[PDB]
């Protein structure tokens, strides 16, 4: 009995599963998950010190690898000065304006403690600054678990898709299908005039990763001008990811506010929310919308130093061109093994689908992969020493610590993968 | 032109009114804020390196003084890992185990970002367990801003309190009066077969410092149980600070679900809910309830908060909390009396609350509000003036550390002195 085993299992008796987070208890892949002790790099050491390549990265906040020596400094070097105080900090001022430079549509922004606070407040905002209720969301996108977004559509807009939810909480929340914009511009011409905000992934990752297809974020833009509707962009997994502006810098798509995840944090808990000046200044306390959360200076210093590393020149190019190698290679041989394979991509968002379609657009081929071939894919591949999301329904990641010694290892234990389904 | 002038003039034009936390805009002191750059032990350091004695503590987390050696030490050993070197760990199981132990109420416990996020998941696990949709909150209380909580009681359960709400978010949330509990028997006698839950701070926090009356929650306990109704304690301040085991120990009532954070992660943002088994196994991946917040443990609010709670489970830890915040009120009460300045004060444990009231005792939010705020807000500018950070707001509670003896009781005294003399 393995180190993880024995903390799995003792890890039921005062927590849920053995988890905090319900992912990680390997539902969505089967057998009992691995406990970790240590990261580096490109990589995350087991309790039974087993290493692997790292395709997770904490989901998102670790893309200069784990334990960056600079970052690791900024966060020792705070530390001398305290975990937090109850007060405002010159660090809060330095990255409000370093985000704000960075992603030209956020004139103001606020810090909070996640990524479903900001979501939260984003909506808030919206539904304050329109006078409408009502809100537009895609089927197969997560912005956090809020009460009126644990919904799906109605046959009332929306009814809740979980117990514990009142079925007034889903009454204002529309879902539609994702990259469909005719389907959009279908529901704002019937009940526009409710609708105060549409939400949405540019690029879905909560459904494993979706690109949008040509013409739905620009068509989004254009539904959302015509009809006075604030434009959301979820970038909790894309900001500073798909490209250094974010999804919206590389589509070229302005939305009204945008949501940022742990990334600005350089890895520890925090979430931002923000947006154009005129919605921004009706948020507390100049302002009579009330905020959902309530900046920390490690998760301050360890952003501000992520942030400027990840600026330098080139930076998201690289991690492009070693994402597009390892979904070459993957292909080239899911290909030789004759086992049906796709890829999706979006700078260092990835995704692996067991498909026979050309191409992932919809949530209906997402559903429709073979996700049972993923899971055995998922456990030869951590015997091979590569960590993938626990999940066919989760977007991987890489990070610039990722070189050709790592390449090599995930390739040959795909190779090995592949020759055994 | 100060450093934090100039800072907060800065922080205006990206930043919203120039600060991330509303309340820390000082709109209910007047003014400009401070802006900190360091803190040791009782004391914070502000931009322009003036020291005050310090009764906010960050609003809770830092019972043991700031930037205690131990729990730095601890930081810095984990920072040797990553900063989230991934999936489940054995930090939160240790953590886990370590609080369901200090708090026996807590059968199984889940870890999540915030309090706001805590409050989410608990109230969605009571309307989950219970198949109601209706809750009970109290006129005073913050559990987080979340919009079935931003409401007000209808003249439908609730209306919205502010913009951006729905009408339909706030039509089941009823708003009673703290400290009531004839009120909430009542209202349970003709709606109680509707209510998941009752959700309290056992001492109101946020309305400044209200204890609660003889037999108030003793009564909430008696009340779910004859309704069937979930009883759920937001610990948020008070837990690990009114007593180690929380304001349930302090005053021996069980709930069925709590709310933790501030305490438990030494300083670091998290939240924590637990509770019952039968109520906690419901929640995701084995229950069909959804959590709000999810974040597995990170491992730095882990390090710090096990370090923490250990080191505040040292013997008679809450006790000389509790004297040192005796002495200062009882000093405060004769300073104010010496002046003929009307004023009271409320305590528990290591909360305290400063009034300038005429009324005997403060019991009801209505007693909160009839106080004299605009005093409170001159004070609070003169306390600065002596060297002391007293909470911004006449509507928040203050908060003692380990670290405060003599020379900060000296420092807040000789403070409150002058501050009463200029005062009228």
């Known amino acids: 009995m393995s180190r993880s085993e024995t903390?799995?299992?003792?890890?039921?008796?005062?927590?849920?599963?053995?988890?905090?987070?319900?992912?990680?208890?390997?539902?969505?892949?089967?057998?009992?998950?691995?406990?970790?002790?240590?990261?580096?790099?490109?990589?995350?050491?087991?309790?039974?010190?087993?290493?692997?390549?790292?395709?997770?990265?904490?989901?998102?906040?670790?893309?200069?690898?784990?334990?960056?020596?600079?970052?690791?400094?900024?966060?020792?070097?705070?530390?001398?000065?305290?975990?937090?105080?109850?007060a405002p900090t010159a660090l809060e001022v330095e990255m409000a304006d370093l985000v704000c430079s960075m992603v030209p549509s956020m004139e103001m922004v606020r810090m909070v403690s996640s990524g479903t606070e900001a979501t939260m407040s984003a909506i808030r905002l919206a539904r304050g600054?329109?006078?409408?209720?009502?809100?537009?969301?895609?089927?197969?996108?997560?912005?956090?678990?809020?009460?009126?977004?644990?919904?799906?559509?109605?046959?009332?807009?929306?009814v809740p898709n979980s117990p514990g939810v009142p079925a007034a909480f889903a009454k204002h929340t529309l879902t539609l299908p994702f990259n469909d914009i005719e389907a959009v511009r279908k529901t704002l011409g019937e009940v526009g005039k409710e609708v105060a905000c549409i939400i949405v992934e540019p690029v879905a990752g909560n459904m494993n990763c979706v690109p949008p297809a040509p013409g739905f974020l620009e068509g989004l833009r254009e539904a959302c001008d015509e009809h006075g509707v604030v434009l959301i962009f979820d970038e909790v997994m894309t900001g500073f990811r798909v490209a250094l502006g974010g999804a919206q810098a590389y589509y070229g798509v302005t939305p009204d506010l945008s949501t940022f995840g742990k990334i600005i944090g350089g890895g520890m808990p925090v979430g931002a929310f923000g947006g154009k000046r005129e919605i921004m200044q009706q948020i507390s306390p100049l302002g009579p919308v009330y905020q959902a959360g309530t900046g920390n200076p490690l998760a301050m210093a360890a952003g501000l130093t992520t942030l400027r590393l990840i600026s330098r020149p080139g930076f998201h190019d690289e991690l492009t061109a070693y994402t597009t190698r390892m979904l070459d290679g993957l292909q080239q041989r899911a290909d030789a093994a004759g086992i049906p394979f796709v890829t999706t991509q979006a700078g260092g968002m990835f995704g692996l689908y067991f498909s026979g379609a050309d191409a992932i657009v919809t949530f209906e081929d997402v559903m429709a992969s073979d996700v049972e071939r993923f899971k055995r894919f998922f456990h030869l591949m951590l015997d091979g020493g590569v960590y993938l999301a626990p999940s066919a329904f989760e977007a991987g990641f890489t990070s610039i610590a990722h070189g050709d010694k790592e390449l090599e290892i995930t390739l040959n234990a795909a190779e090995k993968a592949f020759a055994a389904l």
């Open 7 to 86: 903390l799995f299992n003792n890890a039921q008796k005062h927590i849920p599963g053995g988890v905090n987070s319900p992912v990680r208890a390997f539902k969505s892949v089967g057998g009992t998950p691995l406990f970790f002790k240590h990261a580096e790099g490109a990589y995350v050491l087991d309790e039974d010190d087993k290493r692997y390549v790292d395709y997770v990265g904490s989901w998102g906040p670790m893309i200069l690898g784990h334990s960056h020596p600079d970052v690791l400094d900024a966060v020792r070097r705070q530390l001398d000065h305290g975990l937090s105080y109850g």
């Open 129 to 158: 600054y329109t006078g409408r209720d009502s809100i537009i969301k895609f089927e197969g996108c997560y912005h956090g678990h809020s009460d009126s977004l644990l919904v799906k559509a109605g046959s009332t807009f929306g």
